[PDB]
Each structure stands twice: as structure tokens, then as C-alpha cells.
Amino acid sequence: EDTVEERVINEEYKIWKKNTPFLYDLVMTHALQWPSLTVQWLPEVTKPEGKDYALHWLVLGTHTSDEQNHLVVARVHIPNDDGKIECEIKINHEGEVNRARYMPQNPHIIATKTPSSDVLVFDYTKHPAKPDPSGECNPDLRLRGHQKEGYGLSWNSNLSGHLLSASDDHTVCLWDINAGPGKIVDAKAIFTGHSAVVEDVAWHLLHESLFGSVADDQKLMIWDTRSNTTSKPSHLVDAHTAEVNCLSFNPYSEFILATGSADKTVALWDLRNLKLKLHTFESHKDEIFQVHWSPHNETILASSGTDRRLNVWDLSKIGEEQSAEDAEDGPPELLFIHGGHTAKISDFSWNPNEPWVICSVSEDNIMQIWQMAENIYN
């Protein structure tokens, strides 16, 4: 709604669009009726016989303050070397979907964060193919324990049905959704180490007992569910000089993780020694809200936020000599800047089946499916 900034954004986007055949091997844009605050690829892909596309799926949500919201699975066509978006299913949801994540052991089970305190669980096989327009939200489970909404949600990939949530109430709640409800589950544990909004939580990818939390108190905390305290973490890290909004564990190392912050930096961490930060990634011009490691490349990381950019980093290029030209555009470990969004990026997801494909969603209702040009990472 700033008519001056809108022109700057639109003119920069026009230059971006003219360069897309050079910068990308794929760009697909779709404008949603409502913005999505969340995106995550489902794990499934098909290459249907006799078609020139693969089918992939996205978990999305809506954001309308006044009207009916939905949890959405979208069916998308990604064209072969030699697009289209349809609704796979749509489920009535009470309030906007702050975050939606599929359970790795059963990808038709989706947990959501809403604008209210209960975390919701939906089994999409147990909802009608078309939602009832009366709009009632009938979650399969309500997970109680929080006093406020929040923005962080993580399924344990090693212990089926174990879910963490981060909240503006300064806590992390843990549920085992297997523990008999008649549809309400109370938190198994409430972790109170942080003294400010807990922005994000993530399970370790290998150690079933370990998870990390990050908060507006500038701290990264490492928690062990085997500990008989919920007040004191195993490790407390003074991570950033402002709010910490996201964390991501490296899927190729049990030791490495990244955090992103309102200080406009991504930090790199080694669990073996949290007395020192391994690296600071600099180039974002505003608050970072999301970070994700590449599912395919151990040295590749991406970050997004309020500056309307998604940066892709390559750890392997840290410290490399640069041309005068490359030094002007940023540090050597900055692989790519995605400039396709004209508003804050709310979430993004690396495609788990098609290397280098990302889906990113923004506050102006845009969803982009894109892949940087091969000549950039080669």
C-alpha cells in the first residue's frame, strides 16, 4: 500500500522477468485467491505414461481474516525437458494456516498452526473430496498446551507421531499423537527455556531425542527429551544480535545446522562446539524468516524473508577469490538471488524429487515454481 515503493518493486520485477530465460531453466507463476503463509512439497512424484510432465503435490493454506480458510493440497504439472495447478483436496480450516507440515511416516497426515493456540491434525483421507460450504472445521485431533498462536512446527522423522510446536507464549509443546484422546491430546511436555516468543522448532534428522528451538531472545537452544527437566536445555547458544526466526539441520551431517535472524544474517553451527559460530552468510537487506538445506547437495542452503528475496548459498565457495564483477554482487558463497517475488516471502520448499526446483510463496498471493539455470551450480 506504499505507492512509491510499489513502483520501485514493479520496475525491478520487469528487469527480472526480461532476464528469466538466462537466469532460470524453469519459472512458473500462479496467483492464488488468498495468500498462502505456508508451502511444503509432498514426497510423491509420478511421470504418467504418454504425458510431457510429471505430477508433484504442494501442501498450501489460505490467509483471509474475514472469510473461510482452507488447508489445500495442490496437484501441479512440472514440464519435462521435451504448467497446470489443480486442487487435490481442500479442507475447511478455522482461521489462516500459519504452517502446515505432512508427517514423514504417513504423508496424508498434516499438522497445522492456526491463529489460535490448539495445533490441529488432519488425515486428508478422512475428509470429503469437496469441503462443505457451511465451513465447519472438524480436525481429527486438537493438540492442547499452548496459550497463544505461533509459527514453528516439526514432526519427528525417527519417532512416528511425535510433534513439536513453537509459540508466541514463549514455550515449545511436544505431543505423541498416538496417545489416546475424545479428539483432544494434552502436551506430553512443555519446554520453558526461552524468555521470549519461540519463532521456530526443528527435530534433529537422526537423533530421535534431540531438537533445536530459536526465539526472540536471540538464543538457539538444543533440547534432549531424555532429560528430566523442561526448563533447562542441553546447550544454550547466544546465536544472533536480534530475534532468531528459523533453524534447519543439514540432512548430510549429524553435527551441522543453520539459523536465520532479524540481524539479516544466516549463522552456521556445529553441535560438537557451540562456543563459536562457524560462518555468517551476509547479503539479505532485511529480516530473515525461513532457512532450508538442499535435500540433494550437502553444501547448499537457502534463506528468505522480508527483503522479498530468496538467497541460495554454497558453503564450498566460502573464502574463494572473486573477479571485481562478482565481488560487487556479494560474497563468493552467495550462489543465486531469486528476485521473482514482489512482496515478503512467507515460506519456501525444495522439491525432494527434482534437484534445484523450489516453490516459494509471498504475501501478494504469488506462488512460483522455479529452477536456477544449470550454468550457475555447474
UniProtKB/Swiss-Prot annotation:
Superkingdom, taxonomy of origin: Eukaryota
Effect of Q40K: In SPGFX9; uncertain significance
Main location, first listed in the record: nucleus
Residues modified to Phosphoserine: S323
A GO molecular function held by the record: histone binding
WD-type repeats, residues: 40-93, 99-144, 152-186, 197-238, 244-281, 287-338, 345-372
Cross-link entry Glycyl lysine isopeptide (Lys-Gly) (interchain with G-Cter in SUMO2), positions: K126, K130
Pfam families associated with the record: CAF1C_H4-bd, WD40
Cysteine pairings via disulfide bonds: none
GO cellular component terms listed in the entry, alphabetical order: ATPase complex; chromosome, telomeric region; cytosol; ESC/E(Z) complex; histone deacetylase complex; nucleoplasm; nucleus; NuRD complex
Residue numbers bearing the Phosphothreonine modification: T3
PTM annotation (N6-acetyllysine): residues: K90, K130
InterPro entries: G-protein_beta_WD-40_rep, Histone-bd_RBBP4-like_N, WD40/YVTN_repeat-like_dom_sf, WD40_repeat_CS, WD40_repeat_dom_sf, WD40_rpt, WD_repeat_RBAP46/RBAP48/MSI1
GO biological process entries: brain development; cellular heat acclimation; chromatin remodeling; DNA replication; negative regulation of cell growth; negative regulation of cell migration; negative regulation of DNA-templated transcription; negative regulation of stem cell population maintenance
The entry's keywords: Acetylation, Chaperone, Chromatin regulator, DNA replication, Isopeptide bond, Nucleus, Phosphoprotein, Repeat, Repressor, Transcription, Transcription regulation, Ubl conjugation, WD repeat
Localisation per UniProt entry: Nucleus
Subunit field text: Binds directly to helix 1 of the histone fold of histone H4, a region that is not accessible when H4 is in chromatin. Subunit of the type B histone acetyltransferase (HAT) complex, composed of RBBP7 and HAT1. Subunit of the core histone deacetylase (HDAC) complex, which is composed of HDAC1, HDAC2, RBBP4 and RBBP7. The core HDAC complex associates with SIN3A, ARID4B/SAP180, SAP18, SAP30, SAP130, SUDS3/SAP45 and possibly ARID4A/RBP1 and ING1 to form the SIN3 HDAC complex.
Protein family (similarity comment): Belongs to the WD repeat RBAP46/RBAP48/MSI1 family.
Free-text function comment from the UniProt entry: Core histone-binding subunit that may target chromatin remodeling factors, histone acetyltransferases and histone deacetylases to their histone substrates in a manner that is regulated by nucleosomal DNA. Component of several complexes which regulate chromatin metabolism.
Disease field: Spermatogenic failure, X-linked, 9: A male infertility disorder characterized by spermatogenesis maturation arrest and non-obstructive azoospermia.
Protein name as catalogued: Histone-binding protein RBBP7
Lineage: Eukaryota, Metazoa, Chordata, Craniata, Vertebrata
